[PDB]
Design a protein around this ligand. Structure first.
Ligand code: ADP
Ligand code: ADP
Ligand code: ADP
Lengths: 443, 418, 28, 442, 436, 111
């Protein structure tokens, strides 16, 4: 019916009203102290007062760190921007890694603006241009004005345009009998389609037929928009949207990441603060999630040390499964979790714990009931012993071949023999390594 | 006959549900407890508003990018509509820098150094370097020896606008590549030719996968004009900026001339076609849908965004084919207006708001809408189903044949508990 | 009733007529 | 056509109970790997789960790529099967993570339902109105069948499709509205007064009778990555062929995911996931593995098949050694299908099948000696020797390869063991690793 | 203006100093470090005098001793209209600029030019607008009535004013600003007339107003080079500006200062984590400091005797000796118990958290024991645990709960070191299975 | 008229957009022709249209020889891509030459 991939049995942290975690809630089993710390972090993010707060999720493999970050994102809701990221994303061939890090920092901060739009709309009735007295004079264009007559439901207006709006109108390929949509903030024109007041069965252009827009021609409507700061920076650095030749030639060029200067960021911040002071916009800070943080270089960590001290920084969540490991880009610096000691001071470490046999068994139970499979009790005990013997994940993804082998025998029951066949057909890391050691030519 | 219909949440409905769940600090247990019991009532009214129809909680409107502009707006026989969009970011420049570095005057040497570096010491000048010009003319085949001095001293955009396909002499060192004589054959070649079909893979892939009927999936979030530069007290800066932003050659090149205006050039004024400012250089978009960033509220997404409404649109076809008279029970008047506009879109026979007399006398009607006395009434649907049996019993015996009662249910919500 | 057709608006424009017996080309 | 390395494998050779036949469908032997591949094939065909990594491991010349080709041929049509190598990730204009993201998104197909209208009939009159320059184009078309005759309106693209592929009155054309394609089926009027400008010999077709306008429902499969490239910029359809899609932003991918879910929620489109095959996966940086470990956990993720012929070797980007050249985090989230070496009868059957595909009539003793030299040396050498033995055999003008031609081909062309034997006793003739060599023969 | 949630250095409003440059024990959010604050006050006086150029100082000490706090104090004590550029050591490693070019751009961004100009402006509230058209509409006549709180006048309009008023609609009762020489008219808002909302202007309507401009050398460098416009100041692709335009800018600025049309305002460039620069960057920095238009460079580092980048030897502070020869070094020291508790009380006041005395004592004890930043992070996370139990004051139990939930450096190393079979080592070995 | 072209000419002719009036095409004509990574999709369509016209009896396919001399200087990534690309249906016969004996492959420290 649905599609499932390694998650989506997790619906949140599953806490109480006081911050106490239940044993089985939200698809989580165990990890009580980590879930309580994550709930405190969720409350801190929802307070909307702090800047540049960093936590680190430190534990072994298959202990539930990405699951906890997903639960953080699900608990915060879709209004708060969440930016998932791996450590290998920051190495770009178009721009330096520092700019990619700052771009993700500004992408993790949201905004909510209520915008007023001046709108002309209607069905085009009369489209008559007027000519210039000397059109080959070198300066000045061919026409002078274009008269456009629009009609609506209980309304009809005639507009006199300068040529610049008419160039967009002509680029939209409008004619007489079309319903158009002119917005006055940027001069953009949208052509909706043919009016339904004429015949609709004599075309060959697979176009749809709309009726007349209700209300008057000239309106002022309120639109609530959700944007980020990186959208404002990107729109200002590569300007498209005007009707000047720089804007029209900006759309035709191939896009490329540039190094956005700090001056543009300060001016965008000043404009956003002026919008907030007018009661128009509101600020929604969010979370940046960086997975496999040990893949970063020493330069990226050194820039993070300065980027966390800014006054507009979001909450940063990191995760790593490393012990005493040399930092990449250095040769002798041995540090906990592969993170240098200058960053650990600005951090709050949340420690995750390994599981038990019963926790493995019930995690396999929820993963079986999410994938729409039913197993026997003895097969479940075999899977739990198998998960303790080899890995939790190997017991997790052996469920689907067992289900396929159960289906191919015309049964809707997973039994011990299907699990034995799945063992015989698929190996794990330990048995493959044991085959590799006792091999002739790297078998 | 009592049967309930189960519906599954849509993407917008689930997004609004998750926003409402995260907004109220996750006291969902208290919401369920006081839902079993029946200012929490104002909290659960938002939830029932979300599962009823997403437009009641927040109306869908025109989806357009945010305009990062400060234009001339109205603080409310023709009306003038002039382009006036600016950028909110203002870059201020002193007059001294402009007047002493960029404009010529008596105490600087902008024009003198420009002439010295561009005319007198240019190596393509035929008055001083005729041998190089003759060498390049033998190399390329240009009929004029001033072509290189003209190419080297005009910008690339001005070169690529006014480029003409002038002829060149055969006695030169520049001949035609194999790729060019392949491409020049198929300029006006028709289909079913072997050489024409072997060089037209892209158009065949365009019409093989129906690329002129696909929909646009992405539009940008913010659109902005270029940053305005302000100099206080200088009209020359304004003139130069207006000339750069709205260059008549370039803006004329990116669009067309009206056809009746072209008729006024060619016939009523005697201007030949070769003297026209050349036009039509803007690239064609992929579809008609890709030509702008503005999307419209369509009356096909309105059906699919509400799951209960889509299940009614699935269910009314059988009742219309079987020829019945349906009646809907509601609780608000907002969805009375919503079903008014939906039924006028679907052009069905319904009431305009005596009712019993019009119900008995007229059988041409189809669907009745009431807000909490019929007999020829066969199929009844509970949209906003509440299991308080006092209202349901009086609704049941308010309205000969077999009677089927229907209830719409949304999976994974309050109503599955209810 | 029958809906009217869309108005056809071609002034100052050329014409190519391709009939059964004979073809035209009108120029300005 | 031409003969490839795995041209004899079209399918997997499995029964209805997922049990392999000993010799079927071009595949012989390797029962456990074929059964596991059939299980993975049904896992793909169900389409209910996403982001599962499968590793195929074993010695060289064992049938790993043969297994991948059997899976691809049993997959069937309109299911994406992206086959890449590990060396193609490193590019000068794309990051490794961006190239891996594009390779992931190539393997997810979207099946879009479309509603078209087909129009066929004789053309009565074409009127085309154009500007003086030639930009604005409009006109009317009068098409006609035996029973009906209507007048249509034309646009710029329709007039462009009418002008090229020249249509006159009396020709029979077929128009598809949603694709914008005009095909000329022939001519029926046979006009007498023909201006002798062209050498047209158009076909005589009959009058189409019945309804002029017919509706039909068409289905086409597009990839996800094609939708990102199309929506990325203004001329992305050119970038689909030139490959100039430089680092598509994340906002495009988020909005495309949202619109794909919206199209699924209405019934216009459905998601058909596919198989991404990575041959020589050990030829990858550790940053690629760290990206793969978290890109396997997304909703839009295909089933990834990887092949390795490497033991405990060095992992690239690091300074330690790992099993299969892969880190243990990637090996944690993978199930492993192992492959075992062949017997003499399996090698004989392989050589007989490859001789049947290449159309070579081998003798019995020639087959026995080819099996002997394929069990002492490798299988690919004895497979390569067959065409050379055939080309030697046609020099004597007999269409049957004897043991003499096989012996001649074995004499003329060398194996790896004979090559290292010849090199290791004449080390002065060849260039040393220190760059020293002896050129003079005295 | 200047939106900000709460910064980590948000309590520092400058250097707490007397009129004789003596540091008070607690002033302007800075406590302790008397000698370092006195040295930074001397450097501040060096910047404010403006008669010397190209002096580099170095702020070296142990980590978490207030070096960035000192830099923020100097930057806040400079105030506005004086350039202050703050960069990191890893910022200059660009893919489109060379390292010396990025260092040159950062050098010229820190010196500015003060230009004073005056313009004549119109400000008032629109009373009534008449536009007249003829029979053919070839010419347009107009009258505009505009008033302030002191006078009222009527103006006769020409064609371009009428076109500039028809564009960007102006109605009655609007407060507008008109520039005559450039033709730019801005709508300030709407007047307070019920019958946005600003007040009616006062005084004269024709005002000559003086605006003091400050423009850096890098901006004039970008504009004077013809290879890109002023939009490269925002897009950020200037692309290796040539040297000859910089000598033209230098000579033009020198003769502008000679004529009296401009003044030179030098500033401070701050390089945080200076030890991450290559030796080529150090060698460029050595010779870039003897220029006449060079700012005062502040470098901060916390390393001991470590390897210089790009080399194979070790140097004090990570910097070569020829760079250290031209530097004067300010040394910061570690903190006491009382300084730590005063820092924590100030961070409590800035975070709007009310603390008990016992909670403050426990935070001081665990800050002396572990780290200052660890307690300064624990204090804001304890308030949410306190607010979950619905009380305002943060008590000892909330601090102990936050200390249990969130670990520090030494404890995390301790739990790692006896569980290293479950973590991935330097050799990539790990044990995931529970048993065996 | 019998004409001879190679498949790479067909690839670079089909990749280059057909001559229109857009500013981008004539801009790229006036600029430096940088090479681009030709996708496998375009090569696939070129192969299917070539096989379609081969089946009609019009066109004929002539495979040739790619001679790479002194192949000791190739990196191991190119060797792995050679292993991939030798299995294609449309591949020609490739001839290699080398004068080394026992030597390490470039890019590997121990092979
Ligand atoms: N407490 C838990 N309850 C249910 N499932 C869990 C729990 N912890 C981990 N899992 C499952 O185990 C797997 C661990 O994956 P992940 O968290 O990404 O790795 P890591 O633990 O190294 O971060 C996931 O598939 C997750 O669904
Ligand atoms: N079971 C089989 N059926 C058919 N052909 C096979 C089989 N096993 C091996 N081959 C042939 O042997 C060769 C094996 O090489 P390949 O599969 O490319 O590499 P590897 O075996 O190392 O994965 C292929 O050319 C294939 O045609
Ligand atoms: N003398 C001081 N007065 C006030 N706050 C201080 C002082 N010294 C350090 N701090 C505070 O301690 C925190 C960490 O010090 P910081 O300056 O980041 O250390 P470093 O000097 O290593 O950069 C900062 O938030 C800073 O405000």
């Amino acid at each position: 019916v649905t599609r499932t991939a390694a998650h989506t049995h997790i619906k949140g942290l599953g806490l109480d009203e006081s911050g106490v975690a239940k044993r089985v809630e939200g698809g989580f089993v165990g990890q009580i102290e980590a879930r309580e710390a994550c709930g405190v972090i969720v409350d801190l993010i929802k307070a909307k007062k702090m800047s540049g707060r960093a936590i680190l999720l430190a534990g072994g493999p298959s202990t539930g760190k990405t699951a906890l970050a997903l639960a953080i994102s699900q608990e915060l809701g879709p209004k708060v921007p969440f930016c998932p990221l791996v450590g290998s994303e920051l190495y770009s061939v178009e721009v330096k890694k520092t700019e990619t890090l700052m771009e993700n920092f500004r992408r993790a901060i949201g905004l909510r603006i209520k915008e007023t739009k001046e709108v002309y709309e209607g069905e085009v009735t009369e489209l008559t241009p007027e000519d210039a007295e000397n059109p080959l004079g070198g300066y000045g264009k061919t026409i002078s004005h274009v008269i456009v007559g629009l009609k609506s439901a209980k309304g009809t207006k005639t507009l006199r345009l300068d040529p610049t709006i008419y160039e967009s109108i002509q680029r939209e390929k409008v004619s007489i009998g079309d319903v158009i949509y002119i917005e006055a903030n940027t001069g953009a024109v949208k052509r909706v389609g043919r009016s339904d007041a004429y015949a609709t069965e004599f075309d060959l252009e697979t176009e749809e037929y709309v009726p007349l827009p209700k209300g008057e021609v000239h309106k002022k409507k309120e639109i609530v928009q959700d944007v980020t700061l990186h959208d404002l920076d990107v729109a200002n650095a590569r300007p498209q949207g005007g009707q000047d030749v720089i804007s029209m030639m900006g759309q035709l060029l191939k896009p490329k990441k540039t190094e956005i200067t700090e001056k543009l960021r300060q001016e965008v911040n000043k404009v956003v603060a002026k919008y907030i002071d007018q009661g128009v916009a509101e600020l929604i800070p969010g979370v940046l999630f960086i997975d496999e943080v040990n893949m970063l270089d020493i330069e990226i960590f050194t820039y993070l040390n300065k980027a966390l001290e800014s006054n507009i920084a979001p909450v940063v969540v990191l995760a790593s499964n490393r012990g005493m490991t040399t930092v990449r880009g250095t040769e002798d610096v041995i540090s906990p979790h592969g993170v240098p000691p200058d960053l650990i001071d600005r951090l709050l470490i949340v420690r995750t714990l390994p599981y038990d046999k019963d926790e493995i068994r019930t995690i396999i139970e929820r993963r079986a009931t999410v994938e729409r499979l039913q197993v026997e009790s003895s097969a479940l005990d075999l899977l739990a012993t198998m998960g303790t013997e080899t890995s939790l994940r190997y017991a997790l993804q052996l469920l689907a071949p067992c289900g396929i082998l159960a289906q191919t025998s015309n049964r809707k029951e997973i039994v011990v023999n299907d699990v034995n066949e799945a063992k015989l057909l698929f190996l794990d890391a330990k048995r493959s390594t044991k085959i590799l050691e006792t091999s002739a030519n790297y078998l | 006959i009592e049967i309930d219909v189960l519906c599954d949440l849509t993407q917008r409905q689930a997004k609004l549900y998750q926003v409402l769940k995260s907004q109220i600090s996750t006291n969902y247990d208290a919401i369920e407890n006081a839902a079993t019991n029946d200012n929490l009532i104002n909290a659960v009214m938002q939830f029932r508003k979300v599962c009823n129809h997403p437009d009641l909680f927040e109306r869908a409107d025109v989806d357009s990018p945010f305009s990062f502009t400060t234009f001339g707006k109205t603080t409310s026989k023709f009306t003038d509509l002039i382009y006036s969009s600016r950028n909110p970011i203002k870059y201020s420049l002193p007059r001294l820098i402009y007047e002493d570095l960029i404009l010529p005057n008596y105490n600087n040497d902008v024009d003198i150094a420009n002439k010295l570096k561009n005319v007198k010491f240019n190596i393509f000048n035929p008055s001083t370097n005729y041998e190089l010009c003759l060498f390049l003319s033998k190399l390329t085949g240009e009929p004029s020896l001033n072509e290189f001095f003209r190419v080297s001293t005009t910008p690339l955009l001005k070169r690529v606008i006014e480029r003409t396909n002038g002829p060149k002499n055969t006695d030169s060192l520049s001949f035609k590549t194999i790729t060019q004589e392949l491409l020049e054959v198929t300029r006006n070649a028709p289909s079913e030719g072997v050489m024409a079909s072997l060089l037209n893979v892209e158009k065949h892939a365009y019409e093989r996968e129906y690329l002129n009927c696909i929909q646009r999936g992405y539009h940008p979030n913010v659109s902005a004009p270029p940053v305005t530069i302000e100099v206080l007290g200088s009209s020359h800066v304004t003139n130069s900026i207006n000339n750069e932003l709205f260059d008549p050659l370039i803006s004329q090149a990116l669009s067309d001339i009206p056809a009746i205006t072209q008729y006024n050039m060619h016939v009523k004024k005697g201007i030949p076609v070769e003297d026209f400012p050349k036009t039509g250089l803007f690239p064609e978009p992929l579809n008609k849908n890709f030509s702008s960033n503005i999307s419209m509220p369509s009356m096909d997404r309105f059906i699919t965004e509400s799951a209960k409404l889509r299940k009614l649109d699935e269910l009314l076809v059988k009742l219309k084919s079987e020829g019945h008279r349906v009646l809907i029970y509601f609780q608000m008047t907002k969805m009375m207006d919503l079903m008014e506009e939906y039924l006028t879109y679907r052009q069905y026979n319904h009431i305009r708001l005596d009712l019993v007399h019009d119900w008995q006398t007229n059988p041409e009607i189809f669907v009745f809408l009431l807000s909490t006395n019929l007999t020829a009434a066969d199929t009844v649907i509970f949209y906003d189903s509440d299991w308080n049996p006092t209202i349901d019993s009086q609704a049941m015996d308010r309205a000969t044949r077999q009677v089927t009662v229907y209830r719409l249910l949304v999976r994974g919500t309050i109503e599955e508990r209810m | 009733f029958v809906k009217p057709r869309r108005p056809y608006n071609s002034e100052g424009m050329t014409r190519i007529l391709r009939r059964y017996e004979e073809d035209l080309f009108c120029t300005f | 056509s031409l003969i490839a390395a795995h041209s004899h494998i079209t399918g997997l050779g499995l029964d209805e109970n997922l049990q392999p036949r000993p010799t079927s469908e071009g595949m012989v032997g390797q029962l456990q790997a074929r059964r596991a591949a059939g299980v993975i094939l049904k896992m793909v065909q169900n389409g209910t789960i996403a982001g599962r990594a499968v590793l195929v491991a074993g010695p060289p010349s064992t049938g790993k790529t043969a297994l991948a080709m059997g899976v691809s041929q049993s997959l069937g049509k309109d299911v994406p099967f992206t086959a890449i190598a590990g060396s193609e990730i490193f590019s000068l204009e794309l990051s490794k993570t961006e190239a891996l993201t594009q390779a992931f998104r190539k393997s997810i197909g979207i099946k879009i339902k479309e509603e078209t209208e087909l129009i066929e009939g004789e053309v009565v009159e074409i009127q085309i109105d154009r500007s003086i320059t030639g930009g604005h184009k409009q006109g009317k078309l009068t098409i006609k069948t035996t029973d009906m005759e209507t007048i249509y309106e034309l646009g710029n693209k329709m007039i462009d499709g009418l002008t090229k592929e020249k249509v006159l009155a009396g020709d029979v054309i077929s128009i598809d509205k949603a694709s914008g394609k005009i095909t000329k089926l022939g001519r029926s009027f046979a006009r007498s007064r023909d201006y002798d400008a062209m050498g047209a010999d158009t076909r005589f077709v009959q009058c189409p009778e019945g309804e002029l306008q017919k509706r039909k429902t068409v289905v086409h499969t597009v990839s996800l990555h094609e939708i990102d490239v199309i929506n990325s910029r203004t001329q992305g359809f050119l970038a689909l062929f030139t490959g100039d899609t430089g680092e598509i932003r994340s906002e495009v991918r988020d909005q495309i995911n949202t619109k794909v879910a919206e199209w699924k929620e209405e019934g216009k489109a459905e998601i058909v996931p596919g198989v991404l095959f990575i041959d020589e996966v050990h030829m990858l940086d550790i940053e690629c593995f760290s990206f793969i470990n978290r890109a396997l956990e997304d909703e839009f993720a295909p089933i990834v098949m990887m092949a390795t012929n490497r033991g405990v070797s060095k992992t690239r980007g690091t300074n330690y050694k790992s099993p299969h050249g892969l880190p243990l985090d990637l090996l944690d989230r993978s199930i492993i299908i192992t492959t075992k070496s062949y017997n003499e009868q399996e090698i004989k059957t392989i050589l007989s099948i490859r001789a049947q595909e290449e159309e070579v009539e081998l003798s019995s003793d020639a087959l026995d000696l080819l099996t002997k030299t394929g069990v002492e040396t490798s299988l690919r050498y004895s497979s390569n020797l067959i065409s050379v033995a055939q080309q030697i055999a046609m020099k004597r003008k007999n269409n049957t390869v004897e043991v003499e031609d096989v012996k001649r081909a074995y004499l003329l062309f060398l194996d790896s063991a004979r090559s290292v034997k010849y090199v290791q006793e004449n080390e002065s003739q060849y260039i040393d690793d220190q760059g020293n060599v002896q050129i003079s023969i005295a």
